């Protein structure tokens, strides 16, 4: 029972810009009746399956990318992307197949960008929901860049923080942005108990916040 | 042209049995080995067991021999059965197989496992329409609002897939055993409302298939 141990545990990078990931086994993987290091790395992107990179440890499996490189020996394996795509985007786990089957804890590749501001958008209750006794405002902050972000939620001019959700996306496979989702739940008698709602998101790539509001007039 | 796919519950409550049948396709099983392999929320990998051309098998030592792997090579089915499930047990539980003998080429997409005692519930699914005009020549983001449900996953679509791009589907967040999640898209205002625009939500879980057109709503 071999361990694999990687580093970095996450890494970010430009597009374009080399990247080295490193890959420990406790025990070598060198096989003496084979001369062959059992060693593979898999590429898993977000909502998808792991994908064999490498083999033997430095063997590339047929239709990767030419830029995807792996080499090392015994104890010691390192993975090099020579020109990191967009699409990179991924986890890269190294495994070891000699003795049983192991699997290192990942290396998280992340993509640095340019800064992108995020279109804001406002979405009152559904009727629907309404009729069930709920009202969730909604407000959609999308395709920005850096990842932090800070939504604050505003009835009638005063800030409410209970009942707010907020998720974010995983980077844009194609454009590296973030996306956000923030959800304000009342139930339907709160929201009648107000008028103004506003969603009022700052970001880096701006001074002034951006302001999205409607009324329930 | 191998392929694998994973069917299994979805949900398990703690202390009760898990069945998953990976169907391969493209190889007989008389020749190759399949494999499971399960990925816990948190990512990474764990091996589970696999079984060989011959039947013989191997599993995980970690997993205390409550794990068991047959197969039916006429029907090209492997069946996974793990006992007495606990919560750090759920996880995406894939088939896998290696055309060498190793390492594995071809996974399954997996099959989600949620193991707790809550109780399946289906989703309600809101639009989401903007409060006031659209601009001329301005794009417009719509959405849809899925609240409620449990266990994971959904799966939203935009105008059955015909809407692909400018879609974003934010991940699920728990509160209170119950799943909340949005999805936004975002097209030309020449296109909406002049054309339909539907989110297809559906939680295989609950057998529940909805449909919401986004329609303007009275400013
Ligand atoms: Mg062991
Ligand atoms: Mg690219
Ligand atoms: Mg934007
Ligand atoms: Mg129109």
């Known amino acids: 029972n071999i361990m694999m141990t990687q580093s970095p545990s996450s890494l970010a990078v430009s597009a374009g810009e080399k990247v080295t990931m490193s890959c420990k086994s406790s025990?070598?993987?060198?096989?003496?009746?084979?001369?062959?290091?059992?060693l593979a790395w898999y590429q898993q992107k977000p909502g998808q399956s792991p994908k064999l990179l490498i083999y033997?440890?430095?063997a590339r499996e047929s239709g990767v990318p030419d830029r995807f490189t792996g080499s090392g020996s015994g104890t010691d394996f390192t993975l090099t992307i020579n020109s990191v795509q967009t699409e990179d985007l991924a986890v890269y786990y190294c495994?070891?197949?000699?003795?049983?089957?192991?699997f290192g804890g990942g290396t998280k590749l992340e993509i640095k960008r340019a800064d992108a501001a995020p279109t804001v958008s406002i979405f009152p209750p559904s009727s629907e929901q309404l009729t069930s006794g709920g009202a969730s405002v909604v407000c959609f902050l999308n395709n920005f860049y850096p990842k932090d972000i800070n939504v604050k939620w505003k009835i009638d001019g005063s800030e409410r923080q209970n009942g707010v959700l907020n998720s974010w996306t995983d980077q844009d496979s194609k454009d590296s942005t973030y996306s956000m989702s923030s959800t304000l739940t009342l139930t339907k008698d709160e929201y009648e108990r107000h008028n103004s709602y506003t969603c009022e998101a700052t970001h880096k790539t701006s001074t002034s916040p951006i302001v999205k509001s409607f009324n329930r007039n | 042209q191998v392929q694998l796919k994973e069917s299994g519950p979805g949900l398990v409550a703690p202390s009760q049995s898990l069945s998953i049948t990976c169907t391969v396709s493209?190889?007989?099983?008389?020749?190759?080995?399949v494999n499971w392999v399960r990925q816990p929320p948190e990512k990474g990998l764990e091996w589970l067991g696999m079984?060989?051309?011959?039947?013989?098998?191997d599993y995980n030592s970690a997993l205390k021999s409550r794990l068991s792997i047959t197969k039916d090579n006429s029907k090209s089915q492997v069946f996974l059965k793990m006992n007495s499930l606990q919560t750090d047990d759920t996880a995406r539980y894939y088939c896998?197989?290696?055309?060498?003998?190793?390492?594995?080429?071809?996974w399954g997409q997996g099959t989600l496992v949620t193991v707790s005692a809550a109780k399946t519930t289906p989703p309600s699914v809101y639009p989401l329409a903007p409060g006031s005009a659209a601009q001329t020549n301005s794009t417009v983001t719509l959405g849809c609002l899925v609240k409620g449900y449990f266990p994971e996953p959904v799966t939203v679509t935009w105008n059955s897939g015909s809407l692909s791009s400018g879609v974003h589907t934010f991940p699920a967040v728990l509160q209170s055993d119950l799943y909340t999640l949005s999805s936004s898209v975002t097209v030309p205002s020449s296109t909406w409302p002049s054309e339909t625009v539907t989110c297809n939500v559906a939680h295989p879980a609950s057998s529940t298939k909805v449909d919401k057109k986004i329609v303007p709503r009275d400013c």
């Open positions: 495994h070891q197949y000699l003795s049983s089957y192991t």
């Open positions: 079984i060989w051309g011959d039947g013989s098998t």
């Open positions: 493209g190889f007989s099983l008389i020749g190759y080995g």
């Open positions: 025990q070598s993987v060198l096989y003496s009746s084979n001369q062959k290091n059992y």
């Open positions: 896998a197989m290696g055309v060498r003998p190793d390492p594995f080429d071809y």
């Open positions: 033997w440890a430095s």
